[PDB]
Design a protein around this ligand. Structure first.
Ligand SMILES: Cc1cc2nc3c(=O)[nH]c(=O)nc-3n(C[C@H](O)[C@H](O)[C@H](O)COP(=O)(O)OP(=O)(O)OC[C@H]3O[C@@H](n4cnc5c(N)ncnc54)[C@H](O)[C@@H]3O)c2cc1C
Ligand code: HEM
Length: 572
């Protein structure tokens, strides 16, 4: 029993969500008040992600002898932080199923990393930052026939990005004029894009700095480019999907002020008033989850420290052993949380069967939108606040390739596709850590990472609706349909250099994050003071039940997941 080696439809896989959807969609309720209490703990944690795991860890630090149960509905621990594995040519090749890297922090977060043996500066040498640039490789843009008239792959992209692992002097980029000159657009559209970089103008002339800023927070980037810079509808399509990965929506939902702060073009002349993105374990932040699980339940794997975790062998049969004071219980959907007698009764469903356990304390570390269906003591106001945290769907696909000669031939290590389902397609980060060595030889297998976000661009939707509609679209897609999109797009982009998707793909893992990033405050649709009041109301302590998850901070980062766990534990 070893989830990390599974391929196919992963992420929120079949079996993880059905009981939750009976509560959320059908309003079925699962009461356990008539069942005997089976087990008793000091702390019961709902949700086995980084935040739930952190809550167990900090609670135990404060209560060394604590008995702790973690209830988790996926078939593996870690939530968004999942380890993916491939086998090729005798060796394991690692990938990240979701939460990707760390930055370089509260004292509590520092204290957690140190106690786990995570030295952040180790990545200065573990991340092979000059590997792809040293091979002469650059980032490219892929234009699709349907949108631009013809398929064209344009390399040498100098566009600077928010979470950039490439040293800026090492982009192997061309000039804006040279690079844009190759765009499959009319001469007029190319001149207009080029002038965007070569000859910025004050497109908001007349307005003071304060009025410009107000305007930019209430105007989408797309509209700013359309109405103020004057780019054509065909030009702006170049920008449509650039924000898909880091914000979970396209340029039509990106506030222009947020585009400015992300380094997007168009603002240099308005008169308005970086760190290497290399903190990446070979399986992403699943290492952080695995680190905590081993530290919490030492029978699961041997060793200690950030080096040997990478290839440590986890025995899942040791996760949920009684007597062991910390127990992690997978494939288990919590359905009921109720204060009683200075304790908390927790009900969960497992293989269709209901169970009841007790803790003195409870931390709700699951999706915040799930909490109203579980916590029976919520006022209507707080339940409603919780339900306003509408999470964004994302899909992170791992693809194993026989070789990557087609990438070498095309001179690329990463593609941006403005309008296709997958907007980000890249050879995986080259990272050597512990006994794991990143693939090096283009004749040999390598992992590809690629990001698909089911946005509905230019429809007039607010962000919450784009999120919910995105989930409807994902729900309506079989694994077969997802696989076709992968193979169709890889074939169209790499086909010209000899790629053959049927011959050259030797593994596919689709991590379906239907409930991906936490909601965050979007100044195009939300009022800041109202949004903050909703946030603080939603995470309010309820008796002996505290609420965590990154959701509780409206902030989709592993460090928010840790700090919300810390706050929750201290309240208890
Ligand atoms: C695709 C993607 C990429 C990301 N990349 C990064 C990155 O590079 N850096 C970064 O800092 N952050 C990143 N994140 C943010 C990520 O959400 C956090 O880093 C962290 O993984 C979230 O931890 P969590 O514990 O808050 O939530 P989760 O990981 O979502 O854990 C909550 C868990 O509770 C479970 N649960 C829900 N309902 C129930 C129930 N009724 N009973 C039991 N369990 C339940 C859920 O299924 C889930 O497994 C990324 C997120 C996504 C989706
Ligand atoms: C990949 C699998 C999934 C798909 C395709 C999916 C799809 C959807 C859709 C279309 C909705 C309605 C739109 C919305 O309100 O956001 C929804 C809502 C919801 N989902 Fe999921 N979902 C999945 C997984 C999960 C998981 C893993 C959980 C919890 C563990 C979950 C719990 C819920 C709940 C509770 C709601 C109700 C939201 C509310 O009432 O506020 N779903 N999902």
């Amino acid at each position: 029993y070893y989830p990390p080696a599974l391929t196919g439809l992963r992420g929120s896989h079949p079996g993880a969500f059905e009981v939750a959807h009976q509560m959320g969609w059908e309003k079925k309720t699962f009461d356990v008040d008539h069942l005997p209490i089976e087990e008793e703990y000091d702390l019961v944690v709902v949700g086995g992600g980084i935040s739930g795991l952190a809550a167990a860890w900090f609670y135990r630090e404060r209560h060394p002898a604590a008995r702790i149960l973690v209830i988790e509905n996926h078939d593996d621990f870690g939530g968004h932080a999942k380890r993916n594995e491939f086998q090729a040519g005798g060796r394991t090749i690692l990938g990240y199923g979701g939460s990707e890297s760390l930055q370089s922090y509260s004292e509590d977060a520092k204290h957690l990393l140190k106690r786990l043996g995570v030295e952040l500066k180790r990545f200065e040498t573990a991340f092979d930052t000059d590997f792809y640039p040293g091979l002469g490789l650059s980032r490219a843009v892929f234009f699709d026939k349907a949108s631009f008239g013809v398929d064209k792959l344009v390399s040498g992209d100098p566009t600077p990005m928010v979470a950039d692992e490439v040293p800026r002097d090492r982009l192997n980029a061309r000039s804006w004029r040279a690079f844009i000159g190759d765009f499959p657009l009319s001469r007029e559209d190319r001149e207009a894009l080029i002038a965007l970089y070569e000859s910025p103008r004050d497109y908001l002339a007349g307005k003071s700095v304060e009025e410009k800023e107000t305007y930019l927070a209430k105007t989408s980037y797309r509209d700013y480019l359309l109405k103020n810079v004057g780019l054509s509808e065909t030009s702006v399509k170049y920008f449509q999907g650039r924000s898909n990965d880091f914000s979970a929506l396209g340029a039509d939902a990106l506030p222009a002020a947020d585009a400015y702060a992300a380094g997007f073009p168009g603002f240099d002349a308005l008169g308005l008033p970086d760190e290497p993105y290399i903190y990446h374990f070979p399986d992403g932040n699943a290492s952080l989850a695995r680190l905590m699980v081993r530290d919490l339940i030492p029978a699961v794997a041997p060793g200690r420290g950030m080096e040997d975790i990478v290839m440590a062998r986890f025995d899942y049969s040791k996760l949920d052993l009684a007597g062991h004071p910390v127990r992690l219980r997978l494939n288990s959907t919590a359905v009921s949380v109720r204060n009683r007698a200075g304790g908390v009764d927790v009900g969960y469903s497992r293989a269709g069967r209901l169970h009841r356990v007790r803790g003195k304390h409870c931390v709700m570390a699951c999706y915040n939108m799930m909490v109203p269906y579980l916590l029976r003591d919520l006022s209507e106001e707080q339940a409603h606040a919780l339900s306003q945290n509408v999470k964004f769907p994302l899909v992170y696909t791992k693809v194993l390739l026989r070789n990557w000669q087609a990438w070498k031939t095309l001179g690329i290590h990463e593609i941006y596709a403005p309008t296709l389902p997958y907007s980000r397609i890249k050879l995986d980060f080259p990272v050597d850590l512990g006994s794991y060595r990143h693939p090096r030889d283009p004749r040999q297998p390598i992992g590809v990472h690629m990001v698909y976000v089911p946005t509905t661009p230019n429809a007039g939707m607010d962000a919450r609706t784009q999120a919910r509609v995105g989930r409807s679209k994902l729900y309506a897609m079989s694994f077969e349909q997802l696989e076709k999109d992968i193979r169709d797009q890889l074939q169209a982009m790499l086909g010209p250099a000899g790629f053959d998707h049927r011959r050259d793909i030797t593994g596919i893992t689709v991590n379906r994050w239907s409930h991906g990033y936490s909601y965050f405050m979007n100044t195009l649709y939300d009022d800041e003071a109202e949004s903050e009041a909703l946030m603080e109301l939603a995470r309010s302590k309820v008796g002996n039940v505290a609420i965590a998850n990154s959701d509780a901070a409206w902030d989709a980062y592993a460090h928010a997941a840790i700090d919300q766990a810390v706050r929750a534990v201290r309240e208890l």
